[PDB]
Ligand binder design. Sequence first.
Ligand SMILES: Nc1ncnc2c1ncn2[C@@H]1O[C@H](COP(=O)(O)OP(=O)(O)O)[C@@H](O)[C@H]1O
Length: 301
Amino acid sequence: QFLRPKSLDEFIGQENVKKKLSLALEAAKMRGEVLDHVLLAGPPGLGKTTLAHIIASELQTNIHVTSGPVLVKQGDMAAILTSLERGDVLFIDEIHRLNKAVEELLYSAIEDFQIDIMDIQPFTLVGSTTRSGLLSSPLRSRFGIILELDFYTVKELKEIIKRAASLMDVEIEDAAAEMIAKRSRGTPRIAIRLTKRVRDMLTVVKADRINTDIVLKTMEVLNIDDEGLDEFDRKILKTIIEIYRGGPVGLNALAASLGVEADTLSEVYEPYLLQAGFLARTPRGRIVTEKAYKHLKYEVP
Ligand SMILES: Nc1ncnc2c1ncn2[C@@H]1O[C@H](COP(=O)(O)OP(=O)(O)O)[C@@H](O)[C@H]1O
């Protein structure tokens, strides 16, 4: 995890998020008070986990990691709550997936810091979700700080790439870093994994630095096109084009045809497809745009 930022000063991008978090985080440290609960929302790979760890580290408290789909019985949640020390961070990934059982108990420990009277040390709840709207109304109004992360710019991603390459002790030319950033689908996690693969090409071809040639060879091997779309991205668009005539097609129907969970489609793949203008959502369902037809070389109906 030597590539993960350890402080906000090492976190490139998300300027609005950082200025908001920094304000409340520094104020709380200065007062020796427990930070207000924070909600981190946005597509995966954008640094929500990273920020959660940064928060605990800045407050100099312990972070307790867990996720909604794991805490089934109240006992599971109860144990974690009691292990919390004053000022500790309770980080819950996919918090919108907490079953009513543990959700009620969590909400309870937040209203007065005491579960059914049997006592909980004041703590900071930091939840993570792809869509803040997926959270229940009750728990939603519990976070005093809501941070919405959107995709990064190509410039920010390029900077993240150069930073990663330097840490892996490998030289890379600006134009090459730009090329990778343009194909990272607005996501730091994607950009870093791509940089590692390009690093492997640099190793096999025995080059002194990553250039455009090395990047293009890597992308052909990985099957990533000039827009950064991978095999499944294209499969989604092609399926809508061929099986559904460009759409509109419902989320459930599309998911069934692709053999994947609707969630993985709407929370993981569609976000960027919508942002990049390849897909659009209508009341009747998802539809492909003219840009997708042309990018994939299909005659525009
Ligand atoms: N702003 C950033 N600068 C550098 N690396 C980042 C940034 N945001 C995310 N990453 C990197 O990407 C990977 C993914 O991040 P993570 O925090 O797990 O995403 P999320 O929880 O939103 O899915 C991490 O390896 C991390 O170190």
